[PDB]
Amino acid sequence: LYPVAIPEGSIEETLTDEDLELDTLIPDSPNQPYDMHEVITRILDDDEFLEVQAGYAGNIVVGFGRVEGRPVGIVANQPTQFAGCLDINASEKAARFIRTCDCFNIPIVLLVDVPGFLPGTDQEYNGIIRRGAKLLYAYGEATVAKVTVITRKSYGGAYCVMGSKDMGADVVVAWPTAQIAVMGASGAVGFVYRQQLKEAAKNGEDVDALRLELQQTYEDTLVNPYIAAERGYVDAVIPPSHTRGYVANALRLLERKIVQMPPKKHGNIPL
Amino acid sequence: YAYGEATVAKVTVITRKSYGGAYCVMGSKDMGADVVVAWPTAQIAVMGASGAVGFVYRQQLKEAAKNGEDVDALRLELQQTYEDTLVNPYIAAERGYVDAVIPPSHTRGYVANALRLLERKIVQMPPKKHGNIPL
Amino acid sequence: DHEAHIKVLRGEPTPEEMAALMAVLASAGGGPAEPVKKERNMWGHPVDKLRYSVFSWQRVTLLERTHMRR
Amino acid sequence: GDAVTAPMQGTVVKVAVEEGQEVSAGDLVVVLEAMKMENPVTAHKDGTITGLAVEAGAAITQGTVIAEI
Amino acid sequence: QVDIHTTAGKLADLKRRTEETLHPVGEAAVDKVHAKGKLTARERILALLDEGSFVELDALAKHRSTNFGLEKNRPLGDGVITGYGTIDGRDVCIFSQDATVFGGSLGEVYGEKIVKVQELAIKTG
Numbered sequence A: 001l002y003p004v005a006i007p008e009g010s011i012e013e014t015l016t017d018e019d020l021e022l023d024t025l026i027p028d029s030p031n032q033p034y035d036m037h038e039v040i041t042r043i044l045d046d047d048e049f050l051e052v053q054a055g056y057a058g059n060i061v062v063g064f065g066r067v068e069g070r071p072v073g074i075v076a077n078q079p080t081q082f083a084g085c086l087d088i089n090a091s092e093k094a095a096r097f098i099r100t101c102d103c104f105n106i107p108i109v110l111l112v113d114v115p116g117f118l119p120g121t122d123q124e125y126n127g128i129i130r131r132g133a134k135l136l137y138a139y140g141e142a143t144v145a146k147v148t149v150i151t152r153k154s155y156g157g158a159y160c161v162m163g164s165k166d167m168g169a170d171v172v173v174a175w176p177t178a179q180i181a182v183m184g185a186s187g188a189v190g191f192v193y194r195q196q197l198k199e200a201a202k203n204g205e206d207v208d209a210l211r212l213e214l215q216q217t218y219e220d221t222l223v224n225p226y227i228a229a230e231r232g233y234v235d236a237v238i239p240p241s242h243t244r245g246y247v248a249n250a251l252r253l254l255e256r257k258i259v260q261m262p263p264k265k266h267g268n269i270p271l
Numbered sequence B: 001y002a003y004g005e006a007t008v009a010k011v012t013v014i015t016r017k018s019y020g021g022a023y024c025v026m027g028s029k030d031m032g033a034d035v036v037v038a039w040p041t042a043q044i045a046v047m048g049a050s051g052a053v054g055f056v057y058r059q060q061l062k063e064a065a066k067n068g069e070d071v072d073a074l075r076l077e078l079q080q081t082y083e084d085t086l087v088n089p090y091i092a093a094e095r096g097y098v099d100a101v102i103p104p105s106h107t108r109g110y111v112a113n114a115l116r117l118l119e120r121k122i123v124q125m126p127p128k129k130h131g132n133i134p135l
Numbered sequence C: 001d002h003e004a005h006i007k008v009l010r011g012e013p014t015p016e017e018m019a020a021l022m023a024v025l026a027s028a029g030g031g032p033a034e035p036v037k038k039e040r041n042m043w044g045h046p047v048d049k050l051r052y053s054v055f056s057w058q059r060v061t062l063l064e065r066t067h068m069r070r
Numbered sequence D: 001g002d003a004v005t006a007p008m009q010g011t012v013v014k015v016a017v018e019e020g021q022e023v024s025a026g027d028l029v030v031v032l033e034a035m036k037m038e039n040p041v042t043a044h045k046d047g048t049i050t051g052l053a054v055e056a057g058a059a060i061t062q063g064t065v066i067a068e069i
Numbered sequence E: 001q002v003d004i005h006t007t008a009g010k011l012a013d014l015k016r017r018t019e020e021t022l023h024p025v026g027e028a029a030v031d032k033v034h035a036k037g038k039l040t041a042r043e044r045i046l047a048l049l050d051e052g053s054f055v056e057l058d059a060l061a062k063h064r065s066t067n068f069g070l071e072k073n074r075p076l077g078d079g080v081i082t083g084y085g086t087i088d089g090r091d092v093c094i095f096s097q098d099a100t101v102f103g104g105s106l107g108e109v110y111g112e113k114i115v116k117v118q119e120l121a122i123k124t125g
């Protein structure tokens, strides 16, 4: 640890201008990317980030930084590459980075904007199930402090993988732009209202307009952080500028953890 | 305390009533009961139906009184509806607080089979010098 | 008298230069001397997280010593 | 290799360069709509945009050469 | 209202929800507490903890019951305030129960919130 003088006052009193720049980072359009390094460098001390495997599987960013002098490992989805989907390579990258941090007692901070897994027969044939389960295993096994910040999307199985509460995330916070759902509204509506869309297709109604209206309703009702917050999968929904303060305060709280686990010789991680 | 701390195999058979805080004390699932079974006559509820209907459907019984209805007959009919709907093993079984509802004759077999399953348990608790039981 | 003093090894300041110097050095002092308020808290200490063989000698020389050393 | 290639199947929504323009690593080359994201494709190397082979609306496939530098 | 489909509008909506958590059954219930000369559950936490230290968990929780029409009335926080802070500079976990929400009676979500702060305290020592 480095010595750092902690600023006195609440998280809301200690906001800097660099913190306030997070409030406008997320584009209004759901399909506009942003560079996740803009978040990483603002939550880390001195903007100093040591990226690891920067040239590999750039859809996920991993590396070291300090929060109030404490070394932390970052694992963050990268919207500018493959829309931030998880894939085989990003899974194996993040999985071994997490296991190394956990071996050496380094806390992990996850920054989440993941739409799902990268679709494709090549991913299926090269073993996305088996090799993606490595990241689940690494995160579930890890007993360091685990903090999740959700910025925008956390859908489906990728929600589970990227630091869900029941996978043992110690603290989960979401930005107001977070979108936590089983699947995108287009797919969900095409399923939940299949009977109505086919009935409209019988009647010759404007099935496209109906589908778009149902999708708008589903997005406005469910594709947000608040259902998860209502069930306590998200511990707080916070203004983005609060993120640095929340992370530093949670890491201070979690600096000592005891987790009971069944006795084993060693585990049996997917290989 | 003694029930919660105990780490031996703990089996619960509910024969008829298990109300309120005494349901918690007498070997509830979330107090770490390994297997909870209930007879068909089990009655698992927050409180007896007279008190429950004295509370929910209060106001309704009071406007029945202001309208001059036979509020004692209404209170009886509400009691019966509450008893028939809720005062049974099945709401607890639906929430999995009861692992099975069984014919009473099955009790010896279920207990024997559960004790054989639970003959080896690992339960992990935080480290302490000792607990601080109420005294 | 066996304290190690500040020595002006070369140069001869006037009283006002000595006063300015010593005031600056004292303002540059390291603050409170040591964190005497530091308290023992062994909760979740890393040595408790390690797997030890049931016959491991590190149970004596690592685990036990870390708990018992004061 | 100097080829800038489509990282996935998508539709070209925007072209951010012109042939004969110089570009530097990280400069925006195209915007492809794929997976409901306006993914940027950016220059991997410094040089000049040559052979620009894309137009707005092009439903280009994965691996299609956008240009070479 | 800022367009709820914009990042700024979503942030404004979050601030609105947070404000609603300060008086989840309306301001007249807070008035009744003060008229009885009591503190609210929130004031009790803020008075015990060091000033500015409180971090709330599950502030936006709402109950999931649909029995006897409870689904018609879903106060924010379900009637308990939970979180952590410091007392004399040392971290503590805290819960405070709010008698103005259903008389402070324990529901499923109220209970789950207490269980979460219990687990946090037991985990962190």
Ligand SMILES: *C(=O)CCCC[C@@H]1SC[C@@H]2NC(=O)N[C@@H]21
Residues within 6 Å of the ligand: A085, A115, A116, A117, A118, A119, A184, A186, A187, D035, D036
């Ligand atoms: C139409 O709704 C868009 C189809 C693509 C949905 C995205 S693609 C990447 C994510 N992974 C997945 O399975 N669905 C998501």
